[PDB]
Every structure is written in structure tokens, then in C-alpha cells.
Write a protein that binds this ligand. Structure first.
Ligand SMILES: [Mg+2]
Ligand SMILES: [Mg+2]
Ligand SMILES: [Mg+2]
Ligand SMILES: [Mg+2]
Ligand SMILES: [Mg+2]
Ligand SMILES: [Mg+2]
Ligand SMILES: [Mg+2]
Ligand SMILES: [Mg+2]
Ligand SMILES: [Mg+2]
Ligand SMILES: [Mg+2]
Ligand SMILES: [Mg+2]
Ligand SMILES: [Mg+2]
Ligand SMILES: [Mg+2]
Ligand SMILES: [Mg+2]
Ligand SMILES: [Mg+2]
Ligand SMILES: [Mg+2]
Ligand SMILES: [Mg+2]
Ligand SMILES: [Mg+2]
Ligand SMILES: [Mg+2]
Ligand SMILES: [Mg+2]
Ligand SMILES: [Mg+2]
Ligand SMILES: [Mg+2]
Ligand SMILES: [Mg+2]
Ligand SMILES: [Mg+2]
Ligand SMILES: [Mg+2]
Ligand SMILES: [Mg+2]
Ligand SMILES: [Mg+2]
Ligand SMILES: [Mg+2]
Ligand SMILES: [Mg+2]
Ligand SMILES: [Mg+2]
Ligand SMILES: [Mg+2]
Ligand SMILES: [Mg+2]
Ligand SMILES: [Mg+2]
Ligand SMILES: [Mg+2]
Ligand SMILES: [Mg+2]
Lengths: 97, 209
RNA sequence: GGCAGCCAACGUGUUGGCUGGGUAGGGGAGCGUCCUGCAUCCGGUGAAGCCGCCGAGUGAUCGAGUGGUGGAGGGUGUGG
RNA sequence: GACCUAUCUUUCCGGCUCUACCUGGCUGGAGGGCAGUGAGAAAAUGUUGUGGUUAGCGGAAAUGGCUUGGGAUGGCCUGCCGUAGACGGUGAGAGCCCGGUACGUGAAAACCCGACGUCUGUCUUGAUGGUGUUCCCGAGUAGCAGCGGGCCCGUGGAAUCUGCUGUGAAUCUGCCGGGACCACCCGGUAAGCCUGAAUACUUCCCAGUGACCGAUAGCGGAUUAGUACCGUGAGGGAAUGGUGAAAAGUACCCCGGGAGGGGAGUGAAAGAGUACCUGAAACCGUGCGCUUACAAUCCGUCAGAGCCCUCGACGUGUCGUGGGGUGAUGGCGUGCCUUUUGAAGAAUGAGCCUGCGAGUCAGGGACAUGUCGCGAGGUUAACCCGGGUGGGGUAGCCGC
């Protein structure tokens, strides 16, 4: 996936459209990410009584990586010839992220 | 003879092409065109549908129970058609649908279709779809928009004009064909026929000679 | 008083005469179902399916007439 | 063809063949050609090819507005990309959100295809006449006969080919074929061998397609499937898919031993609660209306009292161009199918519902009849060339 743990993302679809948040964990096998503060569920913890609110995973195509300028951006790649590296670039500004 | 004025992508007129009566003045024959078109769609159809008869279904060799004394209906095989899971009777088998339509009928149908477009002024001629050796869909879309505003367009280009073909390929209602492959179905499907000058001359030459 | 077949008489589809029980069986013309070329239209402001209401056609049957249930496709025309 | 025997032409150096001299041989090594892993001899071994296969990577353009909604990928309206509007996914119809797509790009190693070398072979005197009851030219063979096999050919006038059993020739005036056989002509040269391509097929691997199936269908097998299970064994051989966008799968309280349920929560919806999408019919209940215990009923039909409900106008209920439910009572009335001269039949088949279950397909086939093209002509088959349904193809065929 082009979105990684620790990235800041903007939600572009769903109930929480427009919410910014941080990627707490990524699930590449199913193309979902868990984002802090978005898609919260009212779970019934059963043990001590439990009615907690927790984040639920969101499809990765519903979030966009936020560029350094604050703007949600598609990510592409440059090649760094010195190390053969492949670095994520924001397609709006061309700056690394 | 109808004259088609050749338009350029630069917006100029370069010349004219004269359409022979033999090819573009033919009276349309709807019944003939119907046969030719349906035959073409029949040839397109791939026949790949199959079912298993009672001999092809797994098992079923043994007579299930004795002929007499059980009080049940007599049965010869667990795979008889009346059985759930049994063989299919008169089910589909793979078959070729192509038809051996006479050459003269096919040619006359194409001429009829092209004549119908010509009479309604739906035939256009152009030197090139785009200028240079770089495909550009934006240029071709604008130029075709100047020629026709109809949705479906048949573009007839010579084999060599890769840049013209690629330039129009992605447009939704546009269909691209070479003049040696020209056929009734694609002409009748199009609102307008746009010929490269080379392709139009190639078609006229191979026929009227 | 309505429908139909054959024939006549004229007209740019109406009038008249005769006829219309039916098994095996021959001929003709249609209804409903699915999949498709092309053209059109409806659908989370609720498609199909299902249960009703109120009606319709000479029959197979119909309802782009409407309630309820339901949740994603469907109708129509002309061809295959 | 060998053997003889004239003629004209020919790299160099050897070495040998008892001694020289002529003169034949044979054989090395140098120049030079000519082929090569193949049928035409065999096994090696370097260099090199953005040649191929076995992993991949990049890749354009909307967080756009308003509206509906739980969610927009819907509607309406703007703009953008396109060599990319393939196909999927994403909370509902997405070229511009995601995997991708067009198009480009990439291999250390191994493997495969080449090219180039090495390396291995092979050749190097050829042309030209004459000459002859001379020699050679594939033997247990051909031929022939008996009994068979197979050929259009079923023993036939039966050639050709071929097995077994006997018998058994010629080397060119030879021999074997030209449908018994003979003659004459013609063709060919048996009894030695090898040989690429055009042709056939797909366990398996890769990329795709469908006027193919969509859970009683499609493979027997979407579910532990050749499993469970059956059989001593060979072998036979099933059934079982769908919560929701997300598990947010129902904390806590109440009745109960549990099971199950009722509140309360989650959800757009629990008329989605792991017995879960939709949820038909048979079949089984509960409630309400009418009816039924003096009656003889193919169960209905046509008349029809009474009661119940509903739609109109009027008024307290009563009538109408009415409409429904039930139905006392009267008339009429012998299931359906199959098969029979004839069946309500005491002839056959059906307990009930749902699903499934029978004139189909192929072929320039045959006859007839519509329809379309061309017309004294019509048409191609195979095949060839087009990512197609198009173009070409005269051999044939059918008329004359
Ligand atoms: Mg098997
Ligand atoms: Mg069998
Ligand atoms: Mg049997
Ligand atoms: Mg089957
Ligand atoms: Mg052809
Ligand atoms: Mg009449
Ligand atoms: Mg009758
Ligand atoms: Mg009568
Ligand atoms: Mg009959
Ligand atoms: Mg229908
Ligand atoms: Mg809704
Ligand atoms: Mg459907
Ligand atoms: Mg039809
Ligand atoms: Mg939209
Ligand atoms: Mg799509
Ligand atoms: Mg010989
Ligand atoms: Mg024989
Ligand atoms: Mg002979
Ligand atoms: Mg051999
Ligand atoms: Mg089902
Ligand atoms: Mg099955
Ligand atoms: Mg046994
Ligand atoms: Mg056992
Ligand atoms: Mg619902
Ligand atoms: Mg159930
Ligand atoms: Mg259900
Ligand atoms: Mg009584
Ligand atoms: Mg009596
Ligand atoms: Mg009576
Ligand atoms: Mg009898
Ligand atoms: Mg009878
Ligand atoms: Mg009976
Ligand atoms: Mg009885
Ligand atoms: Mg009997
Ligand atoms: Mg019975």
C-alpha cells in the first residue's frame, strides 16, 4: 500500500469525510488502515462492565495522504540514483513525505 | 457522383474526392442488409456452450434395483434424465454459427450501407486525424467535434497511420477500421463515416477498378 | 346486441350474403419465460421477487394502475 | 559401374614401395577451398546479441460544488486526463479514490534460442573419347503351387499387396509392373539402410474468451469429496453456499436449572440476532365475521331468504345502474388422465406442495415450400492474407 503506519491522512469518503487522523496500524492483506479518531464503534465489552468506543478499520482508498502543505495528495515515486532508493513523492508539490 | 471536400486538422480544405455512383449511389436493400448483418453477428458468436448427456455423467452404469417386485417405478440408471443430477436431454452442445453468405450479397450490402450515409451527407474525408508523429486524443476529439457532433463515428484509416488510430482509439463512441476490413455492421452502427483520403482512395480503387 | 372465417360489392375498410360441435390429424395467427445486437426510458426520492387492492382483454394472459413487504436492478420498441 | 585402352589438361614439399631409370601406387606435412553436430561423421569449448523464459517497477487527470442518503460510486452543475473510457475493488452506476490499464522499463543466477570463433571432419587432376559372346549390379530371394489375410473387389475371368507350408530362377538378350493370359510397346530397376517440413494430441504450466452454468444448475465434488457412507472385494458413492458497509455478534437489569424470552443497547434496517438476504407453496396455529346438530352432499353451478362489511345520494334509516363476505332453501349435476366399440366407473396412473423431467443438434446431405442475391449462368472447397464478421482462392458442383 501507498499509505503507511504513522502517516497523517485525510478521510475522503464515509461518515467521517474530512476528518484528519494518524494511521495507527495498516492491514495490507485487506487494504484497510486504522486511523485515530475516525470510524468509531460502540462496542459491548463483556467480562467489570464494558461499553467502550474504539476505532474500526477504514478502506485505504477512503483516505488520502496529506502533503506537507496540508493538502490531500496522490503519492508517486522518484528514484534516488545514489542508493537505488524509491522514495514517496506528493504528486501535487513533488516534495518527499 | 457526390463530392466530399477534404478537411485538414489545421482547419483548411485540401481538395475533393469524387464518389463513384457504383459504390455510393446504390439503392439500400434492407432485407439484404439484414441477412448480411445477422450473418456477421452469427460468425462473431462463439459456440462454447455444453451440457452432459446421460452417457457423459459420472457413474450410472448399474441398474439400481431389480426390474420387478420392489413396488417402485422401474429405472435403468441413476443418471436417467428424470433423476436429479441425471443427464440433460437435447441440451446445448458446442456449435459453429457462421454462414456461407455469397460474396455478391456481402459486397452489395456494404455498398447499400455506404450509399445511405453518402445520401444523408454522413461521409467525410480528411488528410490526417492529427498533425505530426505524436498521438494526441485531445486534438482528435476537437477535430472530430468540428466534423460531426453525433455520438458514434466510424473512422477508416490505412494500416500505417498508427498515430491517427491511437489518437482516436480511446474516444467512447469512435470505432476504427481499415478500409479492406470495411463491413456493413460497423457502417450501419455509425452515425458518420470519416475516411482518411488514402483509405478512401484505396477503397474506391480496389472496387471500381 | 358482440365476435369470427369464406366470398362479393364497392371504397383508400367499411357494407352485405353465407358459414363458425368436433377425437386422430392438417393449416393459420398469437400469449408468457430467459439470453442477446441496436435504439430509448425508469430506478436507494426504492429495481426485481413476493403478498394484496382495484380494474382490463376474444384466449394464452395484462396493469409505464395503485398499497404492503423488500433492497439493486429493471422496462419498452424492433431484430437475433 | 568395374576392367581395359587413346587424348587434352593439371599447387608446393616430402616419405615409402629391394637398387638405380622411367613409372604406377600408397601415405604424411604445408597453401588453399568446402561442410559441421543434422538425414547427409562425433564430442566438445570460448566470446557475444536491449534476443527469449523464470521475480518485478513506473505510469495522466476532481479531497470540486449543490441535493438525496447510514454511506455517493445516484441526480443536477462545473472542470480535467486520455498512446490510459480493459476489467475488478472501494459503504449504491468511478477514465480522474484504490489494484491496475495505454505505454514504457528491468535480470545476479539458471535455462532456451541464435551469431561468431576455436574445434572436428572432408577435399585438392580432372576432363575426354574409343573397346568387348569380359566381370559386377542386394538368393532360399523373385517366381510358381496349396491354404489364408487384405484390397471398391464376399473366389470371382481376379491382377496388385501380404502370412504360413512346399518348390525354387536368371545379373541386362536380365528381371518386375501397365486387373486373367499371350505378343508388341511403355514405365521402372525388387530382394540394404537413413531422412526435416506440411499432419495428430494436451496429464501439466501461462494469458485470455463466452447471445456457457449460477447452488435439485455447472464437474460426482463452490462446503474436510473420491470424503462420509455402502460392499469381503473389484467397485459404488452422497448431502451441506448468502448476517451487516463495518462484528458494531446484543454490556447491564428481569423470568428461568438451562433452553428461550422480555427490557436496555448496536445498526439505515434486528420486518438483518451466528437457527441470520429476499422468505412462495404444501402443512400447522390463534383471533374476528357469517354459517352448521330431521340430515343422504363428484362437493359445484344457476336461482336465493337472512346476517355482516363497504361505496354513493338522502337523513335519524333507506334506496341505488352499486360492490364485497357468508349462505337457510329450490332447480340442475356420474372426478381428472390414459386407454377403449363403450369407463363416474368396481379398468390404468396420481397422498400434498415446491423445484426438476421428453421432436434436439450436426451435414454446400435428400425432397418440398417461403425469402433474398445474381441470372444463361449461379457458386466456390481446401487453402492464402486481415487480432473480426472482410478480401482473395476455378479445383469442383449444379444448369446448358
Ligand atoms: Mg470419475
Ligand atoms: Mg455409462
Ligand atoms: Mg442397462
Ligand atoms: Mg448435471
Ligand atoms: Mg469468403
Ligand atoms: Mg362481416
Ligand atoms: Mg370449430
Ligand atoms: Mg353450429
Ligand atoms: Mg387435432
Ligand atoms: Mg416480464
Ligand atoms: Mg435508504
Ligand atoms: Mg433479470
Ligand atoms: Mg423472438
Ligand atoms: Mg456523482
Ligand atoms: Mg468499470
Ligand atoms: Mg537391384
Ligand atoms: Mg481377401
Ligand atoms: Mg502383370
Ligand atoms: Mg524408416
Ligand atoms: Mg436459490
Ligand atoms: Mg452439485
Ligand atoms: Mg456383493
Ligand atoms: Mg469396509
Ligand atoms: Mg430492510
Ligand atoms: Mg430457518
Ligand atoms: Mg430470512
Ligand atoms: Mg336443523
Ligand atoms: Mg334421493
Ligand atoms: Mg338428480
Ligand atoms: Mg374391452
Ligand atoms: Mg378411438
Ligand atoms: Mg379408478
Ligand atoms: Mg371408485
Ligand atoms: Mg390392462
Ligand atoms: Mg394408485
Amino acid at each position: 500500500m501507498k499509505v503507511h503506519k504513522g502517516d497523517t491522512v485525510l478521510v475522503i469518503s464515509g461518515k467521517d469525510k474530512g476528518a484528519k487522523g494518524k494511521v495507527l496500524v495498516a492491514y495490507p492483506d485487506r487494504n484497510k488502515v486504522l486511523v485515530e479518531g475516525v470510524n468509531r464503534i460502540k462496542k459491548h465489552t463483556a467480562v467489570s462492565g464494558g461499553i467502550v468506543t474504539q476505532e474500526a478499520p477504514i478502506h485505504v482508498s477512503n483516505v488520502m495522504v496529506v502533503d506537507s502543505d496540508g493538502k490531500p495528495t496522490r503519492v508517486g515515486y522518484r528514484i534516488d540514483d545514489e542508493t537505488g532508493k524509491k522514495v514517496r513523492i506528493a504528486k501535487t508539490n513533488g516534495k518527499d513525505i | 457522383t457526390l463530392k466530399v471536400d477534404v478537411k485538414t486538422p489545421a482547419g483548411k480544405t485540401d481538395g475533393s474526392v469524387e464518389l463513384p455512383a457504383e459504390l455510393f449511389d446504390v439503392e439500400p436493400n434492407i432485407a439484404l442488409m439484414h441477412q448480411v448483418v445477422t450473418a456477421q453477428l452469427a460468425a462473431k458468436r462463439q459456440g462454447t456452450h455444453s451440457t452432459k448427456t446421460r452417457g457423459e455423467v459420472s457413474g450410472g452404469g448399474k441398474k439400481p434395483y431389480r426390474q420387478k417386485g420392489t413396488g417402485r417405478a422401474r429405472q435403468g440408471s441413476t443418471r436417467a434424465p428424470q433423476f436429479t443430477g441425471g443427464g440433460t436431454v437435447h441440451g446445448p452442445k458446442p456449435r459453429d454459427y457462421s454462414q456461407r453468405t455469397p460474396k455478391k450479397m456481402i459486397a452489395a450490402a456494404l455498398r447499400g450501407a455506404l450509399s445511405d450515409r453518402a445520401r444523408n451527407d454522413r461521409i467525410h474525408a480528411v488528410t490526417e486525424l492529427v498533425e505530426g508523429q505524436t498521438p494526441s486524443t485531445k486534438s482528435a476529439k476537437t477535430f472530430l467535434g468540428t466534423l460531426t457532433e453525433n455520438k458514434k463515428v466510424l473512422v477508416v484509416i490505412g494500416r500505417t497511420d498508427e498515430v491517427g488510430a491511437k489518437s482516436v482509439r480511446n474516444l467512447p463512441g469512435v470505432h476504427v477500421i481499415s478500409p479492406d476490413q470495411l463491413n456493413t455492421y460497423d457502417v450501419l452502427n455509425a452515425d458518420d463515416v470519416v475516411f482518411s483520403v488514402e483509405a478512401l482512395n484505396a477503397y474506391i480503387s480496389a472496387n471500381s477498378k
